Amino acid sequence: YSIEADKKFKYSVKLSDYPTLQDAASAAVDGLLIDRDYNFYGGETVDFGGKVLTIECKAKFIGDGNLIFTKLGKGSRIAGVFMESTTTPWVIKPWTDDNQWLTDAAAVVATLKQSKTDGYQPTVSDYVKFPGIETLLPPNAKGQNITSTLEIRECIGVEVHRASGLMAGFLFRGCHFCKMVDANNPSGGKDGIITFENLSGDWGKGNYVIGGRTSYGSGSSAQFLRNNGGFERDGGVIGFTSYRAGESGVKTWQGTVGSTTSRNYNLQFRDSVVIYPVWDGFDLGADTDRPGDYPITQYPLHQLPLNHLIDNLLVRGALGVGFGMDGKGMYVSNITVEDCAGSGAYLLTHESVFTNIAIIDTNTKDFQANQIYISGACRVNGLRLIGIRLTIDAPNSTVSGITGMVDPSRINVANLAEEGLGNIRANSFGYDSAAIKLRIHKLSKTLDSGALYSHINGGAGSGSAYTQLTAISGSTPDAVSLKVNHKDCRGAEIPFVPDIASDDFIKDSSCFLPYWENNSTSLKALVKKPNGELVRLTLATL
């Protein structure tokens, strides 16, 4: 029977049969069932002998610090892992019962409680975010560093599915072709919740966060260090949801970490949602002189050819910036940012294109100077602004297609144009007139310089209106104007120079300019003949 049984049954060892996780790992052949809670010490390392294992978790790994898994064979899968710290730290909760953000340091300090969730451990980033909190926090709530971390070290082709936990962290160190799939809402610890760190060895490649969600944590929900997906864009974040990150939802690191670059290239950031981050929704910048990366002489600061594939992202409720990035030659599309306290978008980009961007009700707390900022020479095609609450400062950018109840005086761009509209109709609701206004921002950002109006003659249903063409004079909009059909008179009312017209008032040949000669109660006409010569004629008299 043993011979027969050996060939007809599925192989699996279970933790309940061993004293240590390493003993179970050593006995494993195909499956490994975690069927009892396991308390690990920080730094506890397990060697899986290069075996391709299917680890099924039905219990918890309990401990502060890192549980390190090494030498898992390509194709290994870990499902249902649950990390939980032994320590219950002091956490702050910077939002109210009505879900309003608290920004006052004293109000935030008052939220202090010991819990493994529904808040996060304060860190130095909070000292910046809530000014004065550093001196108000009691010493036992400062400098905590609690995280129960599953560290996968130097493995290739390992996937972690449906992971969860309390004060939990997941670290892929020196890994390639690994994925964090369908994270089952782990509540974060002090460190970033999902980290792909490749500071040593080759640049990380094939590393993904696919689906799932995370909540809380003192740092960023998903973050990458020194990863390059290649032209194939093999890596990134797709279909992910981040809620209440203590820092940012998704972050590609910037600058030097250690003696090398922590920057990232060629990754995908698509179909994801970030809600209520304490800092930013998506922080996709690379620069904050670049050891291990392109020299500043090759690519100036904020002008690296990051080449990320960015599309279909939604951000809501950030206390910081909704969408931030830098880089040159980027193509960004279909971004929707709503209800943010700081800028909806902060773009330190150059020679980049932004298509179909919607920035709705951001910078609601005036944390920044504008709702959307773009530093370099960029192109914006389709920009929706204003919800129900400068708006845009992109000094060197060319924009087309803005929609929304924007205040024109709050727009600053290099060029704004609608080159390809068809025949147009201006429909006016709730007013006695319809209007097409012109504003030359060089002359005035607050006053319209001219207009074409249509005004009701009499009342509704009169079947009569008059059209008027105006011009600003003495900083008074519509100061001068020509009218057609005022009071249904069916004639044109023409403005004339109130005094003797100077020779230089007339512009073109074969034109005349009426002027008033008060001393004779006569209208004269300065005429520029077809040949360019001026002559003054009598136009109307008593």
Measured over all CA atoms, what is the biggest interatomic distance in the chain, rounded to whole angstroms? 131
DSSP character at residue 295: -
Amino acid, res. 131: P
283 assigned to active site: yes
280 assigned to active site: yes
Look-up: residue for tokens 């144009």? 417
The answer to whether 307 and 331 are in contact (CB under 8 A) is: no
Bridge-partner residues for 481, per DSSP? 470
List, in order, residues 6 or more apart from 476 with CB less than 8 Å away: none
Catalytic residue among 64, 126, 191, 283: 283
Pairing verdict, β 476-484 and 465-473: antiparallel
Q: 300, 308, 224: which is closest to 266 by C-alpha?
A: 308
Secondary structure class of 514 (helix, strand, coil) = strand
E strands, 89-204, in order? 90-91, 113-114, 148-153, 159-161, 164-173, 179-181, 184-188, 194-197
37 assigned to active site: no
Catalytic residue among 84, 126, 247, 393: 247
Dihedral angle sign, alpha carbons of residues 507, 513, 516, 517? positive
Cβ-based burial of 470 (10 A; exposed 0-12, middle 13-18, buried ≥19): buried
Amino acid, res. 201: G
Catalytic residue among 84, 151, 191, 280: 280
CA distance 368 to 156: 43
Tokens representing 436 are 């097409």
**Among all residues, which ones are annotated catalytic?**
247, 280, 283
